[PDB]
Coordinates of C-alpha atoms and ligand atoms in Angstrom, one line a residue:
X1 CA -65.3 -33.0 3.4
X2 CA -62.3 -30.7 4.2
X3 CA -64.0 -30.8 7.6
X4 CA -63.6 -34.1 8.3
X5 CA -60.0 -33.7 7.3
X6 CA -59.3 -31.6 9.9
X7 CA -60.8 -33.5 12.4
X8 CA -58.0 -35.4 10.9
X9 CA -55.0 -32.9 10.3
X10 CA -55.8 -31.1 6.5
X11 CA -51.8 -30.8 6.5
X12 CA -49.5 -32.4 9.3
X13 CA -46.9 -34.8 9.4
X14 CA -49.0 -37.3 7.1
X15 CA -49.6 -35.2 4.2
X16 CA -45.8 -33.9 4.8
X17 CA -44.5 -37.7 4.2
X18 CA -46.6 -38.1 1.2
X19 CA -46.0 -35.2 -0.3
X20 CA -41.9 -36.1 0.1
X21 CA -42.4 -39.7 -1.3
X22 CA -44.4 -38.7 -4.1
X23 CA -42.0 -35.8 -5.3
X24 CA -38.6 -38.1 -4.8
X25 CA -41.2 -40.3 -7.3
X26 CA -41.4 -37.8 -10.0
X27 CA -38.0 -36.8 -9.8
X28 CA -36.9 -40.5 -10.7
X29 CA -39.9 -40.8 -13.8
X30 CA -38.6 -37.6 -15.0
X31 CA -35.1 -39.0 -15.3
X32 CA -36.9 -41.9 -16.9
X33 CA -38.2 -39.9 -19.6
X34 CA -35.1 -37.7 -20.3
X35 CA -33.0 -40.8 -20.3
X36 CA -32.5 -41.2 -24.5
X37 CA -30.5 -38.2 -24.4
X38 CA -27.6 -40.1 -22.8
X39 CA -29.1 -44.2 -23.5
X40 CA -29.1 -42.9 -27.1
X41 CA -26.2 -40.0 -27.9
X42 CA -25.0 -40.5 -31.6
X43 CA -21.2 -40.6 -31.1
X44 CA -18.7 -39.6 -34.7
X45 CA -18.8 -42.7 -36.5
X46 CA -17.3 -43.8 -39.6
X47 CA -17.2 -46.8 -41.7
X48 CA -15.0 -49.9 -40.9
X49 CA -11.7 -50.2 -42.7
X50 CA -9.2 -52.2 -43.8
X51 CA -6.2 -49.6 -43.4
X52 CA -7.3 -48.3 -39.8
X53 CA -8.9 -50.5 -38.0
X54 CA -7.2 -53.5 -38.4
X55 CA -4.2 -53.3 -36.2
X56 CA -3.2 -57.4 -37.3
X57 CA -2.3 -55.9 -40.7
X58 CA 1.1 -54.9 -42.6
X59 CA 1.9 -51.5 -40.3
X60 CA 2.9 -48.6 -42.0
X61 CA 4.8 -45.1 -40.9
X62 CA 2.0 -43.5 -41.7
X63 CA 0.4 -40.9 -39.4
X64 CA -3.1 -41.6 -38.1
X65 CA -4.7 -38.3 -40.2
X66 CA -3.4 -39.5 -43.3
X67 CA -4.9 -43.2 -43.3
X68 CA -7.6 -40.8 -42.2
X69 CA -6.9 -39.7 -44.9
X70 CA -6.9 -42.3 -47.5
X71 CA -9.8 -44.6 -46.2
X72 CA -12.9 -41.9 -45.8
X73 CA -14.0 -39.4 -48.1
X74 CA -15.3 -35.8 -47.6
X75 CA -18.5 -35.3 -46.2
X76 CA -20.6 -32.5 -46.5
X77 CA -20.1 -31.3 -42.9
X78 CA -16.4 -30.7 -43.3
X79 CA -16.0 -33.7 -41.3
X80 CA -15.3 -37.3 -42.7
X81 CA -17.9 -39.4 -44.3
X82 CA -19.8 -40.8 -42.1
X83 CA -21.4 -43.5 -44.0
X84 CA -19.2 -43.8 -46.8
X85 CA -15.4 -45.2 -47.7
X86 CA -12.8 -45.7 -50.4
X87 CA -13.7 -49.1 -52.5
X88 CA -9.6 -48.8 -53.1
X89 CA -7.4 -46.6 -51.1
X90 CA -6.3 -43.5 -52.2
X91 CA -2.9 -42.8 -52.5
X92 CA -3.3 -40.4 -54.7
X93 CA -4.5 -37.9 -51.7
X94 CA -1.5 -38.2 -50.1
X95 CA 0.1 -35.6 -51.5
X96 CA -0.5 -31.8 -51.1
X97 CA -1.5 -31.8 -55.2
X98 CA -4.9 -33.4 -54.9
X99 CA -7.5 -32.2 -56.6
X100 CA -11.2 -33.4 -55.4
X101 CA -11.8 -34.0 -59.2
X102 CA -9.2 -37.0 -58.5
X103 CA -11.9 -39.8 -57.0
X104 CA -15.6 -40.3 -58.4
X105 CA -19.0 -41.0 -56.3
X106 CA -17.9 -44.3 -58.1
X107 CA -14.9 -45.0 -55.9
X108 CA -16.7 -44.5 -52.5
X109 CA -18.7 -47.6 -51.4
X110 CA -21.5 -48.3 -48.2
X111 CA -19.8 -49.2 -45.1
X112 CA -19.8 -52.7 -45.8
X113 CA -17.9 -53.7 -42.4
X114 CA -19.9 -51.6 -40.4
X115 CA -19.2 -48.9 -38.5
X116 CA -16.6 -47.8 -35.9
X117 CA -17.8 -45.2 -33.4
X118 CA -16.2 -42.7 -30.8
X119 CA -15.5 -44.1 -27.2
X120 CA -14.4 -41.0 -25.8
X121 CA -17.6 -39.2 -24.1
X122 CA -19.7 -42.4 -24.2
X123 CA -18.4 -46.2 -23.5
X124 CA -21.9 -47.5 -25.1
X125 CA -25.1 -46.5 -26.6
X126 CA -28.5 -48.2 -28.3
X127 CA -27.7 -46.2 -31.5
X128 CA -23.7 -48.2 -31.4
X129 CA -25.0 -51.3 -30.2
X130 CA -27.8 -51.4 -33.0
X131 CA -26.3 -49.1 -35.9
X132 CA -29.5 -46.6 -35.7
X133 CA -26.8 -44.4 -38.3
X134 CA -27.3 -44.0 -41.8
X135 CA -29.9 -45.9 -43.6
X136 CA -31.3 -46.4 -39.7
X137 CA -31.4 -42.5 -38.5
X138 CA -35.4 -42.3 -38.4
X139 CA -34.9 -45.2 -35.8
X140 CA -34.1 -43.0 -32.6
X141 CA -36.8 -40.3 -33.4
X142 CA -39.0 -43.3 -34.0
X143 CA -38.7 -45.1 -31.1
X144 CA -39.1 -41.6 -29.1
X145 CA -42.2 -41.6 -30.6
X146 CA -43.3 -45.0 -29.5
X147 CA -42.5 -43.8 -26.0
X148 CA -44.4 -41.2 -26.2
X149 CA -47.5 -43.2 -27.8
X150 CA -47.1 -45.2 -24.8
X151 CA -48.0 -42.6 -22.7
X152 CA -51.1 -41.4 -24.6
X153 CA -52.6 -44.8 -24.3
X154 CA -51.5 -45.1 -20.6
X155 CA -53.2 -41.9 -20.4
X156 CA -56.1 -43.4 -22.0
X157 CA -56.2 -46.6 -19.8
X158 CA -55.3 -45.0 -16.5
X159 CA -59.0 -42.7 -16.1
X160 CA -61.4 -46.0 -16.3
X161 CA -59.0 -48.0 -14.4
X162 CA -58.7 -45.4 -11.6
X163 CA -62.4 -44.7 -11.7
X164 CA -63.1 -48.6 -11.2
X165 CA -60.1 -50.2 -8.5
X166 CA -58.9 -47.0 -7.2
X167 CA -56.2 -44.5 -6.9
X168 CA -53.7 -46.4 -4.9
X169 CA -53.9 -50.0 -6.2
X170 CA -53.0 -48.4 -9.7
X171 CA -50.6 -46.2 -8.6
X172 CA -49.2 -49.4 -6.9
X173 CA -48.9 -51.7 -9.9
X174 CA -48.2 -48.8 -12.1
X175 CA -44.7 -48.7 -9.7
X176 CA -44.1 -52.3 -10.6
X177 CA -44.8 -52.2 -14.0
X178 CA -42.3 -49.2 -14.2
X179 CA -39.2 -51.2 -12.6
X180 CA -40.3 -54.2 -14.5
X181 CA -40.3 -53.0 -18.1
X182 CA -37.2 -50.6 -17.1
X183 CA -35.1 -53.3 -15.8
X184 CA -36.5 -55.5 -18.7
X185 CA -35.5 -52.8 -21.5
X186 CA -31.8 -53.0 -20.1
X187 CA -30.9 -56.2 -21.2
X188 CA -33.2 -56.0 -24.4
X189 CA -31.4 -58.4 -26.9
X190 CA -33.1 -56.4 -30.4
X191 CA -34.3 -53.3 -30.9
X192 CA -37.7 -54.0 -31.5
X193 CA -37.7 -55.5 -28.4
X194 CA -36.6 -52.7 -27.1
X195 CA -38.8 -50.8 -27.8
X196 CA -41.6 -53.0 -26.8
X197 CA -40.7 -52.1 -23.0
X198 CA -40.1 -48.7 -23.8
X199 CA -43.8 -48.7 -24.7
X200 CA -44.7 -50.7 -21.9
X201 CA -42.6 -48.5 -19.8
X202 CA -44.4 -44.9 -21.0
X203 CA -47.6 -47.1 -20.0
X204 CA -46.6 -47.3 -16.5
X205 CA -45.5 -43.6 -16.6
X206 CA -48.8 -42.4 -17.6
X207 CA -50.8 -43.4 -14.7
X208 CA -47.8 -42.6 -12.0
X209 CA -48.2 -39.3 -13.6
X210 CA -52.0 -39.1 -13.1
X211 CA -52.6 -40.9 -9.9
X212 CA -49.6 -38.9 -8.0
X213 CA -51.1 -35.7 -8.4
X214 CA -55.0 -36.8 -8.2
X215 CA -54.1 -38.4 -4.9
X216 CA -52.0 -35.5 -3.9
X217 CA -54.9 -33.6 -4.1
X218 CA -57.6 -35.5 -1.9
X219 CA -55.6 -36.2 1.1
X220 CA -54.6 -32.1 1.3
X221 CA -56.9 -29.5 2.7
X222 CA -58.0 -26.6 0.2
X223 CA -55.4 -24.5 1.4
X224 CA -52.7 -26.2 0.5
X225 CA -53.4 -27.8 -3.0
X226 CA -51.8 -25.2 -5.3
X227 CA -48.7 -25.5 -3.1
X228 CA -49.2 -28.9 -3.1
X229 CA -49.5 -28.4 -7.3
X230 CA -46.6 -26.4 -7.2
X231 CA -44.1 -29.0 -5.6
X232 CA -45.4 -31.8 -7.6
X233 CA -44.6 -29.5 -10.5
X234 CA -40.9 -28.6 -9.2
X235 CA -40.3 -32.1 -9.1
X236 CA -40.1 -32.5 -12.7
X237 CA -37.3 -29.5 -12.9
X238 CA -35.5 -31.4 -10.2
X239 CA -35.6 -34.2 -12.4
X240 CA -33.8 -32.9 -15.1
X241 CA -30.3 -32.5 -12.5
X242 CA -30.9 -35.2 -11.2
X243 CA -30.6 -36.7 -14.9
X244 CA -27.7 -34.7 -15.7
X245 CA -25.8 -36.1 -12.6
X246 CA -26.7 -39.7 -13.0
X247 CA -25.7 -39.6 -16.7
X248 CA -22.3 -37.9 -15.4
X249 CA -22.1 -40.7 -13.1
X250 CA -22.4 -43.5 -16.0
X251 CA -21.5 -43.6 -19.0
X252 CA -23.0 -47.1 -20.1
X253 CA -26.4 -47.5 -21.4
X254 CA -27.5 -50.7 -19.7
X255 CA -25.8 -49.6 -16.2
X256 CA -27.7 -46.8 -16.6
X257 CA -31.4 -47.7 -17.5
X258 CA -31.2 -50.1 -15.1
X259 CA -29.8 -47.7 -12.4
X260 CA -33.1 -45.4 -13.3
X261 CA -35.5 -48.1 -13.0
X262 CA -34.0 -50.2 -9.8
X263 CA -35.8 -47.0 -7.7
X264 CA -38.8 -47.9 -8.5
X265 CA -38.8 -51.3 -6.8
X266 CA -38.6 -48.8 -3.1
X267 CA -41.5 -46.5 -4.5
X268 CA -43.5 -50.0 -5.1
X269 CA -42.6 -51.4 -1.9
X270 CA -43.8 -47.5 0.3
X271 CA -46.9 -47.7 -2.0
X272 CA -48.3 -50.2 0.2
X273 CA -48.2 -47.8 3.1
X274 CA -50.5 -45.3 1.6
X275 CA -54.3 -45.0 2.4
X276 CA -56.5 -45.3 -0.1
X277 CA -58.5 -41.6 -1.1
X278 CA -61.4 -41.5 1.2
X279 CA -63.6 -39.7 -1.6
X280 CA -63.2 -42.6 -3.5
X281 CA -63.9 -44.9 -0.9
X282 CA -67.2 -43.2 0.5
X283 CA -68.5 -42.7 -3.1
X284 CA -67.8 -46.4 -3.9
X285 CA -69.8 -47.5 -0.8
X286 CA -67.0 -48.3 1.6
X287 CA -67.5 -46.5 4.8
X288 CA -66.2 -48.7 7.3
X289 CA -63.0 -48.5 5.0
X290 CA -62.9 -45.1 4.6
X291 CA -63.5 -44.6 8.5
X292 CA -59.9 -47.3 8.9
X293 CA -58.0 -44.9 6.6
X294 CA -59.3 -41.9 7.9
X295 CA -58.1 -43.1 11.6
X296 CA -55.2 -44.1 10.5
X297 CA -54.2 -40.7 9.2
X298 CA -55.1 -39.3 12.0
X299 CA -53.0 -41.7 14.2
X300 CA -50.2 -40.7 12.2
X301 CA -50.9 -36.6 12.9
X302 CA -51.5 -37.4 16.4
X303 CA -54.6 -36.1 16.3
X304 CA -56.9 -36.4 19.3
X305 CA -60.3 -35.9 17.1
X306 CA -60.3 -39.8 16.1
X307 CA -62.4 -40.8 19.2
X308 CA -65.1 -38.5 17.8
X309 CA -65.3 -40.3 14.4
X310 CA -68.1 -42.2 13.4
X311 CA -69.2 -43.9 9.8
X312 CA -72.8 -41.8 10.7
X313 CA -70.4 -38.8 10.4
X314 CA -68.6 -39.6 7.4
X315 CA -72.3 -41.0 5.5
X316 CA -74.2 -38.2 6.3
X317 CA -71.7 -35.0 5.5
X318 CA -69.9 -36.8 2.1
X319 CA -73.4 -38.0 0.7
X320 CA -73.3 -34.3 -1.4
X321 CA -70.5 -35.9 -3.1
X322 CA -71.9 -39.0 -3.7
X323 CA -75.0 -37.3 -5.7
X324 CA -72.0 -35.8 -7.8
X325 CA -72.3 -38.9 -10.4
X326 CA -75.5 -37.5 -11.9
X327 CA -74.1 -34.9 -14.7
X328 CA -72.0 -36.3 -17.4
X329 CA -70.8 -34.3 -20.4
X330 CA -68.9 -35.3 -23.5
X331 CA -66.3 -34.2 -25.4
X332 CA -68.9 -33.1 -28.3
X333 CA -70.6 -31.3 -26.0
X334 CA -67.7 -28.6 -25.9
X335 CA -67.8 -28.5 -29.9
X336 CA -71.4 -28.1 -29.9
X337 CA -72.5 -25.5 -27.5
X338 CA -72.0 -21.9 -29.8
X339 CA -69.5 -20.1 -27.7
X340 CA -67.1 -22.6 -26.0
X341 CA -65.9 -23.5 -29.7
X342 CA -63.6 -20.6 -30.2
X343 CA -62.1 -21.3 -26.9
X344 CA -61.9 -24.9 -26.7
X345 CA -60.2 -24.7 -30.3
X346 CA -57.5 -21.9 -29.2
X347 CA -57.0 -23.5 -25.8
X348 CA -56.5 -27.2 -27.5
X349 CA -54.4 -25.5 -29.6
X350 CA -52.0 -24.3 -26.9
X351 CA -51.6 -27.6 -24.7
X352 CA -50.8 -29.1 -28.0
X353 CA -48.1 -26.4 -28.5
X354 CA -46.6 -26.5 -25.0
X355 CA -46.2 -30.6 -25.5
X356 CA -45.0 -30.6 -29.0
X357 CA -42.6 -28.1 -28.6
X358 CA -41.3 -29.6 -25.3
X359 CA -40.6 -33.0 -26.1
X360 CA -39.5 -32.1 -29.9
X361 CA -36.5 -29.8 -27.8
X362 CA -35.6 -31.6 -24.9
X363 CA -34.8 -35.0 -26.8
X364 CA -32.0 -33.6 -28.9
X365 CA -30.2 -31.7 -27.0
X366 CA -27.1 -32.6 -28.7
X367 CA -28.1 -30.4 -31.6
X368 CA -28.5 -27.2 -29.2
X369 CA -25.1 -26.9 -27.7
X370 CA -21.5 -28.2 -27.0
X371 CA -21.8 -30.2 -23.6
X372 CA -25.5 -31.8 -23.2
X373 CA -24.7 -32.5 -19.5
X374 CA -24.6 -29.0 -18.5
X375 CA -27.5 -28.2 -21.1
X376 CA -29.8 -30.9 -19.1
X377 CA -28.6 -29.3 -15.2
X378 CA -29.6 -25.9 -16.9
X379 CA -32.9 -26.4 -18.4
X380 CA -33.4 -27.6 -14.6
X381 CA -32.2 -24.4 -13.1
X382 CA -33.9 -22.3 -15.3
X383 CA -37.0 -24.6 -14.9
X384 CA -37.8 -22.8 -11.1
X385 CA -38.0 -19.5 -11.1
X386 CA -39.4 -19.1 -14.7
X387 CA -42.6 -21.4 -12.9
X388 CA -42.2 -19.5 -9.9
X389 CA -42.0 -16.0 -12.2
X390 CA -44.6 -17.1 -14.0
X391 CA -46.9 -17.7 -10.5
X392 CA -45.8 -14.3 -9.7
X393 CA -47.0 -12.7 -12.8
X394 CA -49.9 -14.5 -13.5
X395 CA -50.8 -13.4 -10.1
X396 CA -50.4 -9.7 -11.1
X397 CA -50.9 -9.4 -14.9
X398 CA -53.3 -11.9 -15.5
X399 CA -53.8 -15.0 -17.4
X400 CA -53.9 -13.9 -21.1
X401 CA -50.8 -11.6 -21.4
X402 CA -48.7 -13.9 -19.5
X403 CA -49.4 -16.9 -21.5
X404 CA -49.1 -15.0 -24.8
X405 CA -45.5 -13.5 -23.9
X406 CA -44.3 -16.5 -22.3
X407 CA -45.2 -18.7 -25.3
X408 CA -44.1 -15.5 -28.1
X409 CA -40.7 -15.4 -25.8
X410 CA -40.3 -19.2 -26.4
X411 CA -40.9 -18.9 -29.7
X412 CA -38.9 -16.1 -30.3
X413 CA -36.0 -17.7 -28.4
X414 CA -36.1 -20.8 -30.7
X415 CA -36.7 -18.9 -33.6
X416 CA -33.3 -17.1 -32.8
X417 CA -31.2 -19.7 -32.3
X418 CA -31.5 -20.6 -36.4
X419 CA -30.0 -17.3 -36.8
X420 CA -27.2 -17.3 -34.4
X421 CA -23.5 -18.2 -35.7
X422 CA -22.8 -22.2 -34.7
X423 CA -19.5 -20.4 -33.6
X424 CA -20.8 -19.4 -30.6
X425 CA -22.1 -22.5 -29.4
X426 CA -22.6 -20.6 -25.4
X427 CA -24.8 -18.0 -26.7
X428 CA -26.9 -20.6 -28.7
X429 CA -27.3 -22.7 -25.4
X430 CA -27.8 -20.0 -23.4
X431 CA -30.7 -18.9 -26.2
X432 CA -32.1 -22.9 -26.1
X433 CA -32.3 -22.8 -22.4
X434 CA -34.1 -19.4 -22.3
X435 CA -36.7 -20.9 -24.5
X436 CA -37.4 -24.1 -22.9
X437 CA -38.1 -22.0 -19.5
X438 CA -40.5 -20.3 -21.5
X439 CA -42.7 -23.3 -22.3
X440 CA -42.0 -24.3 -18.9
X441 CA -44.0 -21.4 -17.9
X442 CA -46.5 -21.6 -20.4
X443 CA -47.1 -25.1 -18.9
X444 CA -48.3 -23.1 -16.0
X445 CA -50.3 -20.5 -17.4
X446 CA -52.1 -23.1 -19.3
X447 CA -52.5 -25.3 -16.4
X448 CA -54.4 -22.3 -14.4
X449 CA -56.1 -20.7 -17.3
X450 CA -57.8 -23.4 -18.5
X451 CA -59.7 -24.4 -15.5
X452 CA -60.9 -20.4 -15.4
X453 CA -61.9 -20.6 -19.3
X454 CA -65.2 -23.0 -19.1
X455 CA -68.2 -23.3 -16.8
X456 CA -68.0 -25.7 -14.1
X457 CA -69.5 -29.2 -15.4
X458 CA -67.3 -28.7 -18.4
X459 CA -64.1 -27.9 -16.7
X460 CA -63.0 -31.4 -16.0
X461 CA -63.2 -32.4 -19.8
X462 CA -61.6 -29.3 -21.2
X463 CA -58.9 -30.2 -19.3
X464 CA -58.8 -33.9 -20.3
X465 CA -59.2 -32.8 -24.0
X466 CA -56.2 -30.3 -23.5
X467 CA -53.8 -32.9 -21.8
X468 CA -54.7 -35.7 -24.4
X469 CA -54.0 -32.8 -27.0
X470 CA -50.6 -31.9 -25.4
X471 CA -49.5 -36.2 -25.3
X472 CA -50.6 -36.2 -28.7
X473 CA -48.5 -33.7 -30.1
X474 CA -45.5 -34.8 -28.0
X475 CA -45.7 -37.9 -30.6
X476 CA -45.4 -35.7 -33.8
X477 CA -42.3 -33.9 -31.6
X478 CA -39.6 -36.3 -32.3
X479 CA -41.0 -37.2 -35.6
X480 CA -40.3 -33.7 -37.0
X481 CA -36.7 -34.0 -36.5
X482 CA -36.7 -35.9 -39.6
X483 CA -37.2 -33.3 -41.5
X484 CA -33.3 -32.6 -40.5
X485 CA -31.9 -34.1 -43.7
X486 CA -32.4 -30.7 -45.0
X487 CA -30.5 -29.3 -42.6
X488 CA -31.0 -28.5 -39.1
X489 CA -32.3 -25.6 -39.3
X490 CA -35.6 -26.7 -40.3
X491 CA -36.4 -28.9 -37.6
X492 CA -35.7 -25.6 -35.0
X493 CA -38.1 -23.4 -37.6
X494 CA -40.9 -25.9 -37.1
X495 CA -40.7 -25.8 -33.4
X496 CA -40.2 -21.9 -33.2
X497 CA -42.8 -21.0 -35.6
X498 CA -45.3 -23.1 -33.8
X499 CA -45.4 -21.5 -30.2
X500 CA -44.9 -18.3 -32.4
X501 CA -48.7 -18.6 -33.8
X502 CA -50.2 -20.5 -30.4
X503 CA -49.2 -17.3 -28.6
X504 CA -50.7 -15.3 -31.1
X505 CA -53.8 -17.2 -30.8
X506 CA -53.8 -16.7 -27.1
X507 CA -53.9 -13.0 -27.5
X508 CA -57.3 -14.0 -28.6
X509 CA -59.1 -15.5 -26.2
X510 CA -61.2 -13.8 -23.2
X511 CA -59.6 -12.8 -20.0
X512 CA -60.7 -14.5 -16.5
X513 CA -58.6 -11.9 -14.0
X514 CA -61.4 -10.6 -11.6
X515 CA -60.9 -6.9 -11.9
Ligands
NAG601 C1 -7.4 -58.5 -40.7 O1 -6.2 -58.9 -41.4 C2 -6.0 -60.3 -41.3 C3 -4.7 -60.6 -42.0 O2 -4.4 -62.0 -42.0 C4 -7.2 -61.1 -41.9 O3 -6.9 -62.5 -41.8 C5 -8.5 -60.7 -41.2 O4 -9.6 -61.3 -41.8 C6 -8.6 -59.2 -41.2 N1 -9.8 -58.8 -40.5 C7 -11.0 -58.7 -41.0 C8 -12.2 -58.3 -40.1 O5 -11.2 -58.9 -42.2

């Protein structure tokens, strides 16, 4: 087949073009999936108040701190109360005598009139316009979740669906659905509606993510589809500045969903431009198609070989990979055979690692430092060369070691940053972004090793079972950030200690370098 393609141009101007498109593509999905850092930033907030808020009443000489003052009590995080206020206020405080033994849990009330929240970094957000604060807090991890969901079952839907119209036509309507449900989620009047079309949205996302690279791959000849694999992976750490910037840009939630999901309406439209894979085509019975497409390409290389193609050309040579169909293999068939159990277990359990840890970090990046727009351009930065590193490495030292210290290095990063002083809010970020370029990197060990671990016919589903693992643990990553009542420190313990023992684990499994 790869010589048909260059009979065609394996990589010229064509794949070039494509490869541009597709990565500008990912760049916008990947601001779609970092968005809720910025669409949903918690801003201070405190209950509504008689005394401060409203301006129509009797005014008063005094200062701004001392109704402060004598509206909100104490919280715990020597800050005000964020969900609690004075039933009467309290005079009393005024002066410098007071005692805290002066008011009872008695004389503080539930913000009745709501809340008041901080303009200042942020002119709106879903958490102000829907009060996800208080009683509401497991809202926002929640609906991360459902995002997340969303992209499992896209996942899910997106193989038979490919398998059955095609790479293209779903990659296509996949675009659509994308701008539809993005533009749709702007203007969402409720929050359950809301996050109805996130859902819907993380749909769409799933099979942009699939198609892109699977069509990626057929149109380039053999030497080029790890660089091809590379890019499409350096597209998601452009992403992340490219979030960072928009979100400088604008500071409104609906201006900016909708300025993340207009895009996509462009990608739709150049969609239409794109052959169809001529694998798929041939297997499916569609020469004459296949032979339109392939001449097409070829016009666009400006390539003289189209005069000497012929459908008896294309039939004869690809029928090898049409008698591919004849071999299926389940997912029990991994857990049954004696020794692939050991590593389909360890290698399950590091995809799930790399995705829980991931999207439990990213997401909250208000929690890991002081200013979230530069912690969102660096995990970006660092994002490049740790893959790049990590090709390097794996290269030289081999696929076991390298994926053990990158995920132990991740972990171990994380781990720190529980330890740290909250003083030194650089060092912590500094400490966060050094960890999430670690996962990055085990990403790419992973992605490598596993195709090496398991004998051919089986390769394909170990590496379905390992990405469905990794999208399903990327649904228990918010969740766990819950658990931050307690404090924060043991949400940040769950996520260190986990890459800690997958590392650990991958110490354990055979190595594939050829030595
Ligand atoms: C603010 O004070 C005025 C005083 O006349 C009152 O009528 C109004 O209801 C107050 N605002 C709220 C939200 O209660």
């Amino acid at each position: 087949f790869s010589e048909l393609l260059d009979l065609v141009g394996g990589l010229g101007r064509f794949q070039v073009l494509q490869t541009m498109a597709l990565m500008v593509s990912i760049m916008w999905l990947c601001t779609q999936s970092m968005l809720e850092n910025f669409s949903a930033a918690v801003p201070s907030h405190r209950c509504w108040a008689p005394l401060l808020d409203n301006s129509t009443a009797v005014s008063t000489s005094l200062s701004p701190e001392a109704l402060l003052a004598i509206s909100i009590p104490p919280g715990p995080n020597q800050r005000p109360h964020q969900c609690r206020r004075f039933r009467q206020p309290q005079w009393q405080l005024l002066d410098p005598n007071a005692t805290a033994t002066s008011w009872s849990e008695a004389d503080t009330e539930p913000c009745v009139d709501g809340w008041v929240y901080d303009r200042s970094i942020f002119t709106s957000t879903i958490v102000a316009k829907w009060n996800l604060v208080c009683d509401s807090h497991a809202l926002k991890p929640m609906a991360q979740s459902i995002y997340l969901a969303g992209i499992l079952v896209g996942a899910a839907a997106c193989g038979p669906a490919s398998d059955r119209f095609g790479r293209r036509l779903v990659l296509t309507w996949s675009y659509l659905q994308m701008a539809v449900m993005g533009t749709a989620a702007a203007f969402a009047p409720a929050f359950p509606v809301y996050c109805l079309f996130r859902f819907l949205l993380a749909f769409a996302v799933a099979g942009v993510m699939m198609n892109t690279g699977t069509l990626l791959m057929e149109w380039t000849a053999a030497r080029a589809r790890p660089l091809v694999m590379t890019l499409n992976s350096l597209g998601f750490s452009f992403g992340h500045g490219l979030t960072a910037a928009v979100a400088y840009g604008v500071r409104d939630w609906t201006l900016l969903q909708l300025v993340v999901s207009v895009p996509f309406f462009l990608c739709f439209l150049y969609s239409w431009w794109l052959p169809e894979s001529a694998r798929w085509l041939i297997i499916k019975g569609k020469p004459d198609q296949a032979l339109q497409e392939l001449r097409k390409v070829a016009r666009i290389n400006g390539h003289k070989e189209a005069k000497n193609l012929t459908i008896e050309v294309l039939m004869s040579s690809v029928k090898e990979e049409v008698a591919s169909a004849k071999e299926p293999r389940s997912v029990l068939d991994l857990f049954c055979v004696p020794g692939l159990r050991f590593r389909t277990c360890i290698s399950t359990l590091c995809w799930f690692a790399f995705g829980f840890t991931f999207f439990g970090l990213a997401l909250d990046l208000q929690a890991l430092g002081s200013n979230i727009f530069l912690l969102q351009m660096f995990i970006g930065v660092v994002d490049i060369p740790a893959k790049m590193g990590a090709l390097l490495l794996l290269s030289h030292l081999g696929r076991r070691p390298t994926l053990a210290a990158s995920l132990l290095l991740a972990g171990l990063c994380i781990l720190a940053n529980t330890l740290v002083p909250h003083e030194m809010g650089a060092l912590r970020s500094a400490l966060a972004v050094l960890g999430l370029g670690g996962v990055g990197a085990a990403f790419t060990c992973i992605t490598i090793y596993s195709s090496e671990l398991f004998p051919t016919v089986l390769r394909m589903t170990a590496v379905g079972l390992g990405q469905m693992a990794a999208r399903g643990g990327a649904i228990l990553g918010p969740l766990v950030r819950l658990l931050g009542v307690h404090g924060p420190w043991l949400p940040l313990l769950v996520y260190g200690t986990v890459p800690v023992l997958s590392g650990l684990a991958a110490l354990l499994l055979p190595e594939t370098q050829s030595l």
